[model samples]
Target: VRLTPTMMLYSGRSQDGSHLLKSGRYLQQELPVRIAHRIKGFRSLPFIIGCNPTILHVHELYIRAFQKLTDFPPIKDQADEAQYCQLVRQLLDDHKDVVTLLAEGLRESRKHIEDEKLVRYFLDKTLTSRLGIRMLATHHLALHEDKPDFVGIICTRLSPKKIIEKWVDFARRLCEHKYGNAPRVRINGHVAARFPFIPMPLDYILPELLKNAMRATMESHLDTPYNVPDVVITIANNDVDLIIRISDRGGGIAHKDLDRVMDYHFTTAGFGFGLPTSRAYAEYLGGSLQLQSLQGIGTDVYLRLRHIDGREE
Candidate 1:
């Protein structure tokens, strides 16, 4: 189905007036198909949990949103397009707590679903798909006007140097808040590398990796908190793909725990969803995120992304 296409189909080339109306109509048709598919999944859930009030509430919200989207009149002109967008904006605002509500549903029905791993599996699947749905709707709305270096939600000239700095700075603040100190981070390699890609998912994936690295660097140096080693980030491209490697001196994961590092809900620090969700975002676009660690030394995470051909002007 069009909804399950591996990549979001868009070329970052210039869009003309006709393109806007065409794309708006595309989303008008596309959103309901995807939403209907998700509703079917909700219907197939095991009975007890499926019928729970919270899950049902989520399911009903989807039902209403699907109806609203499917019932939307064709985008024949700018007026219909604006009205449709208003509806979508309200739907997006209303569904913001979907994941939290799903978690609550699972928690309340915990006894009915005994295998704990199954719970995590349900949540992980739900969240990842939710990310896709949200991205589609939001990206469509964002394309209403041009933004600096952006083609819709995708960045046409994304600079690793600049994006990394933005996220790392945010991560550093989080690290300092949690550990009372944050490790220094240094960016090296192809700092000037620019490419076309969706920044929404990358924004999530890159910062989560940085947060883990900075947290590890600080926690591992408890004895010498003031003298923690720098966490290094290297950006490089082999002409065909972009590679970002994050190196941290946080005592690396032991062999036993290494396997679970990317498993959903298996975190030792904060919410275990960080790594797994980041991996999901990477893989959504056919990219890969991998990790290597030394038993007593440090860890390195390599994020390799396939390049998308797009315009710079």
Candidate 2:
């Protein structure tokens, strides 16, 4: 795998070296083993044999193409911090299809695993492990005191209500600063002292849902001019799961356009990736996202995330 110049001359390979960059060969050398080692632990998972090696090979191709950054330091470097950051971000965007499809594949293939929650746990671990490797790879390059490392899977009881207050404030403040003023927001059934779930997924999911509701309510009130609209957030838990409802009376999605909202191209005033991405994220964990919209009225988003009382194995 060590593709040095001397060997190339003997092999009658094109000496011009115009076809590929130097680091590209290095990445080619690195990724095969990197992914091989990365997925080795998955050998034990209860699923289809090979755990989709075709996907892994496709991922290797993406690595050769998109993940090949110009600056890769075997050891950490302060000088290359900005370069590494840009490269990592580029890789995430450029190779998004591979990672996203891999997640989708696991979701489709991992039925009969019996405990769906356990599958989600391992998916997080796998994806996190992949991301963590890149995080660690930037160690020499980052100038910061806290360079990237996987601060992973903090298993604890957290309040959806509490974790969301900050995001709620952000949206409200956003309205005041950007749109005009805060639409009234109220929280109910939020008395839960603890919900046993990984905070990371909630952290990923909550803000988007809330921001949408917040934006919608503010827009719903825009023409009224005299009265601000009320956005209500409700949190409740059954014995095994947590339920969250975000209601907003924004000009509701037209019946014709209701399906378009999650179409990845349909966005009211935002980047348009949030809704479908959120829906897909909900799928990743065996959770569900449902939307009910009334024409000219508003929308209700119901999210059900499984909570742990004692079931995690």
Candidate 3:
């Protein structure tokens, strides 16, 4: 619907902007229709229908301005059509701060509704089941139990074999959660034999690598018909450094996004905070995270930490 300054003033009238902003529909769906209506000089566009015509019009105007500034060739080449479409699509995607804030507010409101529903179900069904309350209490205790303080002892007594085993188990669990079946996982320690370094606790390392591996596997499954889901973990020693490598058969990271991949809030998958956090953790431990990725091939992540002196090579 047409979004005028008057409507914009009242956008926050309802809880989570429900009264002003539309709900239950994606902007992409309503954007084109709203654009057409505004172009036809329709006044007081249907606000309840959810799309803001004024915002869409302004966004289109900006995109047109960008095109004019760049002097992009018209979409005449068959191959160029996709790139041109992407350019326009990116204008919307990149300006999410301006356009998506309203959409996200609505989503948060819906999430609150879902949380209330879950609470009701838990109180009624789960609490009423025989022995369910006791089981629930036990689970809560298990989940909230205090973990051991191992940071001071990380490189002192931690065993490398234990670390590798933990990573394999973590990877298997992740794959099972995503695919309902765990793929074969293997750990190779040829590097560990050649380099001696005190291994860090699994709590500090396994989760990040496991997550990256699962993403790689899922990407590979989507791009190829073959069931080639596999992840390899290798530990090695090079001079004074201990190197742990996690490689996935999933095609490597995209070239264009490489420079910013480790930056906070920068993700090709959208709204991801994992990679940057992992890198930060590694750097905190006097280690570095290294990534080698090739489009349509595979990705390898390397974690290098300082070696412990007097350890056998």
Q: Which candidate number maximizes TM-score?
A: 1
The model with the greatest lDDT is 1
Candidate 3 has its poorest 10 consecutive residues by lDDT at: 2-11
- Whole-model lDDT per candidate: 0.78, 0.57, 0.47
Better of 2 and 3 by TM-score: 2
Q: Of models 2 and 3, which has the larger lDDT? A: 2
Per-residue alpha-carbon lDDT of candidate 2 for residues 8-75, written as tens digits (9 for 90 to 100): 10111224432222333333345435555445545556656235665555445444543354235542
**Residue range 1-313, candidate 3, lDDT tens digits:** 2111111111113344242122111222223333343333312222331244444554355445344425545434334433544444454454435323423322223233424333222222211221121222222222222334221122334445466677677766766676665546677776235332324323545676667776667756864434666777787755656677888877788888787776544566634435654565455445677898868878888877665433335
Each model's TM-score, in the order given?
0.87, 0.55, 0.46
lDDT (C-alpha) at residue 11 in model 1: 37
Steric clash count of candidate 1:
0
Each prediction's Cα RMSD?
A: 3.3, 14.6, 23.3
Task: Give the Å error, residue 140, model 2.
Answer: 18
Clashing pairs in 1: none
**Per-residue accuracy of model 1 over 51-154 as CA lDDT, tens digit each:** 89999999999999998887888899878888888998999998998866775676567568657566656665667777787777787787787788876777
**Backbone clashes in model 2, listed as residue pairs:** 76-140, 77-140
Ranking of models by TM-score: 1, 2, 3
TM-score of 3: 0.46
